[PDB]
Write a protein that binds this ligand. Sequence first.
Ligand SMILES: [Mg+2]
Ligand SMILES: [Mg+2]
Ligand SMILES: [Mg+2]
Ligand SMILES: [Mg+2]
Ligand SMILES: [Mg+2]
Ligand SMILES: [Mg+2]
Ligand SMILES: [Mg+2]
Ligand SMILES: [Mg+2]
Ligand SMILES: [Mg+2]
Ligand SMILES: [Mg+2]
Ligand SMILES: [Mg+2]
Ligand SMILES: [Mg+2]
Ligand SMILES: [Mg+2]
Ligand SMILES: [Mg+2]
Ligand SMILES: [Mg+2]
Ligand SMILES: [Mg+2]
Ligand SMILES: [Mg+2]
Ligand SMILES: [Mg+2]
Ligand SMILES: [Mg+2]
Ligand SMILES: [Mg+2]
Ligand SMILES: [Mg+2]
Ligand SMILES: [Mg+2]
Ligand SMILES: [Mg+2]
Ligand SMILES: [Zn+2]
Lengths: 213, 61, 135, 25, 101
Amino acid sequence: VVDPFSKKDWYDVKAPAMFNIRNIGKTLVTRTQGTKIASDGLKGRVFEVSLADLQNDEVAFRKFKLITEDVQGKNCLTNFHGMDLTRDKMCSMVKKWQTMIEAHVDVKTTDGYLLRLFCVGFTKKRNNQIRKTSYAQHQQVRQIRKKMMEIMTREVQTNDLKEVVNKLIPDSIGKDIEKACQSIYPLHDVFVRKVKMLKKPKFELGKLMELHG
Amino acid sequence: PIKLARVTKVLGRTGSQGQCTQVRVEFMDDTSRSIIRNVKGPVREGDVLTLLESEREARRL
Amino acid sequence: LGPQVAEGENVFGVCHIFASFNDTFVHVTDLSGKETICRVTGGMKVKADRDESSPYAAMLAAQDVAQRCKELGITALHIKLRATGGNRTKTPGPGAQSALRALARSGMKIGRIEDVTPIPSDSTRRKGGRRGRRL
Amino acid sequence: MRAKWRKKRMRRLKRKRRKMRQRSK
Amino acid sequence: TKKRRNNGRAKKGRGHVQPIRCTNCARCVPKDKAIKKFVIRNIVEAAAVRDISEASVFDAYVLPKLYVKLHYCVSCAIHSKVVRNRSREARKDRTPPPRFR
RNA sequence: CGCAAGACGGACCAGAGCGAAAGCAUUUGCCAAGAAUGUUUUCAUUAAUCAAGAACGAAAGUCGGAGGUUCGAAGACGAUCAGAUACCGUCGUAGUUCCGACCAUAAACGAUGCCGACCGGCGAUGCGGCGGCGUUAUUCCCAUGACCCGCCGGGCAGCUUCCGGGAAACCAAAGUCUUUGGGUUCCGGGGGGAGUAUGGUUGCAAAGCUGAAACUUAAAGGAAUUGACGGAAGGGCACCACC
Ligand SMILES: [Mg+2]
Ligand SMILES: [Mg+2]
Ligand SMILES: [Mg+2]
Ligand SMILES: [Mg+2]
Ligand SMILES: [Mg+2]
Ligand SMILES: [Mg+2]
Ligand SMILES: [Mg+2]
Ligand SMILES: [Mg+2]
Ligand SMILES: [Mg+2]
Ligand SMILES: [Mg+2]
Ligand SMILES: [Mg+2]
Ligand SMILES: [Mg+2]
Ligand SMILES: [Mg+2]
Ligand SMILES: [Mg+2]
Ligand SMILES: [Mg+2]
Ligand SMILES: [Mg+2]
Ligand SMILES: [Mg+2]
Ligand SMILES: [Mg+2]
Ligand SMILES: [Mg+2]
Ligand SMILES: [Mg+2]
Ligand SMILES: [Mg+2]
Ligand SMILES: [Mg+2]
Ligand SMILES: [Mg+2]
Ligand SMILES: [Zn+2]
């Protein structure tokens, strides 16, 4: 009868200054009829963007969740809300004749952002190894998991969210964990695979404007 | 568009009763191109086939 | 009626393809997945319960949704392929591949493909009992 | 007859006897 | 008359193994006895590969793969012909079939 | 995009590990227990198997409380069918989950009691210990982790053998048996009646343990062989098959 898309308007959504590419696409929202404000419905939206769409030379199997925080006149301004890996990367990392070690921590940044970090690693077969399996004993697994937890804790609570995302973009935490765990048992495919937002500070416009420039 | 192709090699006999023939065909316009086709009727090497739709490919045996 | 975008740049959306063994869904949303552009199911095309999951119905639904979203101004689509998941099968239905190919036929640009089938770490008891479905 | 169902029939018959052959009687 | 020395399962030096559910019929079958199959395939089929490679916005964009673990009971494995009966002498041979060309 | 409840810990997960057996898989902490290996420590026969008597004992079931997501006996429907009171589909009650009391039964199986000695090879695998060129990490050094080549001791198994057994299938034990004796516990005597009746005993109940006879019958049964069949698998042929 009446077209619902004649009352729709298009907005442009921006990524924070941390990433090179800023325009991450567009979005749609119904105009304000006085009952419902378009801004209220516009906020709180989550976008999963591949890292290759945010940085030119970075990998594509790492995705970032960005949440709209403020609207500035046809310019939605987002903030970091999460990070994850693609399904096929995780499915191809897990193999049958090796050991997998996983760890998770809850760390609060200096600016109030509470994060939950997950890390995963796999035992690596030796170059001249003849034995089919590469299994780590339980005590070695516990040592490796503790080494993961301490490294993940020491790289978040000291820094703030802006530096945390900077470390997450190339995933230097995984490289540090992999290097530190060489003596216990060699590990490959070490990554921080998921990051969750647990508690946010009170919303501040100045913080967002500094985050976007 | 309609394309012409040349039969390069006869592969085998397909079909429930073996009525169809599986062959390899190369396009006249682009000699590099080659696909696998199912043909109805007697066909040998060197025949020219008229492909009304040249994108489809057949599951070889 | 749509975004003001230059010819060079492509407007992106997300296409959720739900391929079951009984029905097929092609859904188009914005990048946040909160706004629906067009949703067409395989049961709208064929007036029979047999052919809802057929490749033909999926092909028709893909063309319908492609035309509808091309009207509004979306030229490229990201693909989120989904199976039924849960306790049941993880294998996509027979309509997913045909729907995706038809969506490519209609001139739509294809973004990144991603599997989004829900996978439990462990779940409730599956329907059927100890001896399974005896047909 | 399957031995399991034969055993079940014997048990049901014994229960029926026990109900009829009351200890009070 | 025992048909197999290992009783058709892989249970050695333990009492109980937790059961899983057949992918086909949802029957409860012990994990060691069940027939497992790891399937790694392409999301798009052969023709769809060529159809999609032209319509993609990226250059040499690699299509994602599908990884599935399938569990079958004996009846479903036999009926689907993923497992067949063999000769009395050939039953002992437990080398996987030569799929590598 | 969030919230709430309950149940389960995928992939990694293996003819791998632990436990007397039932059985045991998210992280961390605490508590007590244990096998194996190392030992130029200590006691000095303290040992093996076991009537009586005890602890534990899947699932289902019973009695009280707490929760009830999923599944789901019974039940109500829709289909199928000559007929279905079944298989299939929609719902759904006990139950499935936790605590406290009962129940003591499974193809509870390696269908194979425990302790000890002897009797062929081979390659792996898990734990502990010992020895040795050489690659890697702890920026240097030993030393300790990851690999590599060996040896010893327990453990789960595998391949091979005219060791020898057996009716054979098969078994390095199911061998060392008419060339018959290492110790010890339980237990069988053609097939049915029948694990039934009765007595005793335990339990709230369901039922558990012990457990006959009258009568009837010339076979029942094990392993293997050749055929015939199969709504079992794979090949081949035929215009009295098809295309
Ligand atoms: Mg249907
Ligand atoms: Mg339907
Ligand atoms: Mg059947
Ligand atoms: Mg038999
Ligand atoms: Mg058992
Ligand atoms: Mg098997
Ligand atoms: Mg043991
Ligand atoms: Mg797990
Ligand atoms: Mg006793
Ligand atoms: Mg119980
Ligand atoms: Mg119970
Ligand atoms: Mg109760
Ligand atoms: Mg139900
Ligand atoms: Mg018994
Ligand atoms: Mg058994
Ligand atoms: Mg027994
Ligand atoms: Mg050994
Ligand atoms: Mg061990
Ligand atoms: Mg060792
Ligand atoms: Mg004797
Ligand atoms: Mg007798
Ligand atoms: Mg005739
Ligand atoms: Mg004819
Ligand atoms: Zn099955």
